[PDB]
Every structure is written in structure tokens, then in C-alpha cells.
Design a protein around this ligand. Structure first.
Ligand SMILES: CCCCCCC/C=C/CCCCCC(=O)OC[C@@H](O)CO
Ligand SMILES: CCCCCCC/C=C\CCCCCC(=O)OC[C@@H](O)CO
Ligand SMILES: CCCCCCC/C=C\CCCCCC(=O)OC[C@@H](O)CO
Ligand SMILES: CCCCCCC/C=C\CCCCCC(=O)OC[C@@H](O)CO
Ligand SMILES: CCCCCCC/C=C\CCCCCC(=O)OC[C@@H](O)CO
Ligand SMILES: CCCCCCC/C=C\CCCCCC(=O)OC[C@@H](O)CO
Ligand SMILES: CCCCCCC/C=C\CCCCCC(=O)OC[C@@H](O)CO
Ligand SMILES: CCCCCCC/C=C\CCCCCC(=O)OC[C@@H](O)CO
Lengths: 97, 90, 116
């Protein structure tokens, strides 16, 4: 039922779409691999960030300074993952058009 | 752990195969990512187990989200090996 | 849907900021990454090498951030020591080191083949 939340669907379908698009693109193996891997990683990192968010909320509702930092650090990881994804697709698909 | 031998075996084959530098890096990197995600998933589990042995909807949710990450990483590894080996023997 | 990006983006900055400000080891790691990203960008290589150079050091930062979050969770739960507390950080620290060794090896292989 974690899969059914209206956020993962949006994240997932975005990642899933790119994998499909990369699967159809006329690129060589190394490019196709890198295209898929970057989007997959984002999904991987987000899943890990959500898992951390679960552990924090598991402890309780009472806000602690460290509780917020873990979430921010986890969000930062996703941000970096998404940037790496955009840079990857840019560098590889640039001048491909 | 079994994975260390498994990772080695993956590295053995990667070095065994006659592939260029870029392809050889991609193969081993994909395998290493699985270890990293598994290690990170294992870390998350260790935390959850410590807080309480008792069941909580949030405790099981983290473990599920963590195991899915491992799955996706493994899927990514298979796709990588499939694609590159297909191209290599193409 | 548009707002979900903004909220998420704001957290990420707090994460990078807190990580930066609190540790010298992080800032120096951050600098090492940024220099690596820069060097790869101007380097005369093909796109696949450039991406591999960038991706690998990015991954170091990703795992570093993720492990840092796990550490924050452990420290949150209590001052108290624990075998499962040490285990969590031990596992998370291993992941960080693997990502770096890969990064070092990958960066070493690519510059070998390019300059040798
Ligand atoms: C449980 C088994 C799942 C993994 C093996 C079977 C399905 C995946 C096959 C390889 C990945 C498919 C995506 C790559 C693709 O579509 O382009 C094919 C092309 O790159 C071959 O050179
Ligand atoms: C010309 C270059 C094209 C660049 C393509 C950009 C998209 C490629 C990879 C990024 C995948 C992002 C999917 C994950 C995602 O954004 O969802 C998480 C986010 O909504 C959290 O707020
Ligand atoms: C508003 C809809 C947006 C859709 C997402 C963006 C679409 C991205 C690419 C569309 C073209 C697909 C690639 C087709 C192609 O390159 O052909 C591959 C080659 O095998 C042809 O022989
Ligand atoms: C994907 C859209 C998000 C915003 C776009 C901004 C992208 C930022 C950096 C991506 C670098 C793009 C240039 C890559 C490139 O191929 O350099 C040109 C070179 O190949 C000329 O042969
Ligand atoms: C041609 C033969 C080489 C094939 C290499 C394919 C690489 C696929 C996965 C790499 C990850 C290795 C670790 C596997 C693992 O952790 O599973 C262990 C667990 O499922 C046992 O219950
Ligand atoms: C030259 C500038 C860098 C080139 C790539 C630019 C990156 C483009 C878009 C990335 C920002 C998307 C924001 C998504 C986000 O907030 O991350 C979600 C995370 O923090 C929590 O899940
Ligand atoms: C393509 C993007 C490169 C990302 C590589 C990893 C970045 C790691 C650290 C950079 C985070 C920037 C935050 C800087 C910061 O917090 O300074 C604010 C504070 O010091 C004001 O005194
Ligand atoms: C303070 C944080 C700064 C973050 C900046 C984000 C980095 C954006 C793009 C990284 C550089 C990649 C572009 C490399 C490129 O296009 O050159 C390739 C070209 O020389 C091939 O002929």
C-alpha cells in the first residue's frame, strides 16, 4: 500500500516513462545503460529517503532537531540524484536530438 | 557473507570478458551499487529493530521501502549486464 | 503537484547547508566533488566517460548524505550506546567508503586510458 500513495505514482511513472523512452531511443549500449541507470538511481534514492522518513515518524510526533535533519539530508540526497539524472540525460542526449 | 564471493565472481567475469574500459566499469559499478543499497538497507533495518521489537505500521514500512530499493538496484544491475553483454556479443 | 517540488527543494537546501556548516570533513569532501565535476566537464573525453566521471563522485555525495541521515536518526533515538546503534553506523560507513573507492578507481581508470 506504500506503492498506492499519489506521490510514488507520480515519481514512479516519471521514472518508468524514462526507462521506456530510453529503451526505444537509438543509442548505443553504454548510453542506453547510463540513461536507464540515472533514472533508476533516483527511484532507488527516493525509496531510501522514504524509508528513513518512516523510521523518524516511527519514533513519534514530538519534533526533535535531529529528526528534521535526517529528512533534510535524505531530501538532499534525492536532489543530488535528480541533478545527476538531468546532467546525464543532457550530456548524452545533447547533439542527439 | 555470500555477497562478497558473488561480487568477486562478478568482478572475475568482468575482468575475464574482453571488454573495453568503459564497459568494464559499468558492469562492476552496477554490482557495487547493489552492495551499497543493501548495506544502507541493512543499516535502516538495524535502527528499526533497536527502537522496538514490537510491530508498528511505520517499522514494517521502512523495511519494505528499503527492500524495494535493493530490488530496483538488482533490476538495474541485470538490465545493465543484459544490455552490455548483448552488445558485446552482438 | 507543482508545490510538492518547492517543499521538497527547500528541505534539500537545509540538508546541504546543515551538512556543510557542521563538518569540515564534509566541506572538504564537497570541494573535492565540485572540483571533480569541474575537471570532467572541461576534459577532452566522450560523453560516456564524462558522465561516468561525474556520476561516480555524485554517488559519493549521495551515499554520504544518506548515511548522514541514518546517523542523525541513530543519534536522535538516544545518547545511549547500542550494538544495533554501532551496527547501523558501521553499515552506513561501509557504504560511504565503497562509493569513494569506486570513484577513485573509476577516475583512475578513465584518466589512464585517456592519457596513457
Ligand atoms: C526477470 C528478468 C528480467 C530481466 C531480463 C528480461 C527483461 C530485460 C531485458 C534487458 C533490459 C531491456 C531494456 C533494454 C532495451 O530495451 O534495449 C535493448 C537493446 O539495448 C539491446 O542491445
Ligand atoms: C535534454 C535532457 C533531458 C533530461 C530529462 C529529465 C528527466 C530525466 C531523469 C529525471 C527523473 C526524475 C523522476 C523522479 C522525480 O522527479 O520524482 C521525485 C520528485 O517528484 C520529488 O518531489
Ligand atoms: C508530450 C509528450 C512527451 C513525451 C516524452 C518525450 C518524448 C521523447 C522522445 C520521443 C521519440 C522517441 C524516440 C524514437 C527514436 O529515436 O527511434 C529509435 C530508432 O530505433 C528508430 O529506428
Ligand atoms: C534538461 C532541462 C533542464 C535544464 C537544462 C540545463 C542543463 C544544464 C547542464 C547540461 C549540459 C548541457 C550541454 C551538454 C553538451 O553536450 O555540451 C555541448 C557539447 O556536446 C558540444 O558538442
Ligand atoms: C554472466 C554471469 C554474471 C551475472 C551477473 C549479474 C549481476 C546480478 C546481480 C548482482 C548482485 C550480486 C548480489 C546478489 C544478492 O545480493 O542476492 C543474494 C540473495 O538474493 C540470496 O538470498
Ligand atoms: C546547471 C544547473 C544544474 C543542472 C541540472 C539542474 C537540475 C534541475 C532540476 C532539479 C531540481 C528538482 C527539485 C526536486 C527536489 O526538490 O528533490 C526532492 C527531494 O529534495 C525530496 O524528495
Ligand atoms: C552538480 C551539483 C554539484 C553537487 C556536488 C555536491 C555538493 C556538496 C555541497 C554543496 C552544498 C552547497 C551549500 C553551501 C552552504 O551551505 O553555504 C551556506 C553557508 O555556508 C553560508 O555561510
Ligand atoms: C555551486 C553548485 C554548482 C552546480 C553546477 C551544476 C553543474 C552543471 C553542469 C556540469 C557540467 C557538465 C557539462 C559538460 C559539457 O557540456 O561539456 C561537454 C563538451 O565539452 C563535449 O564536447
Amino acid at each position: 500500500a506504500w506503492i498506492n500513495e499519489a506521490a510514488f505514482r507520480q515519481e514512479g511513472v516519471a521514472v518508468l516513462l524514462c526507462v521506456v523512452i530510453a529503451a526505444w531511443l537509438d543509442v548505443d549500449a553504454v548510453t542506453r545503460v547510463l540513461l536507464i541507470s540515472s533514472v533508476m538511481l533516483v527511484m532507488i534514492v527516493e525509496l531510501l529517503n522514504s524509508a528513513i522518513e518512516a523510521v523518524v515518524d516511527r519514533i513519534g510526533s514530538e519534533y526533535h532537531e535531529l529528526s528534521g535533519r535526517a529528512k533534510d539530508l535524505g531530501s538532499a540526497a534525492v536532489l543530488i540524484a535528480i541533478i545527476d539524472a538531468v546532467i546525464t540525460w543532457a550530456i548524452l542526449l545533447w547533439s542527439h536530438f
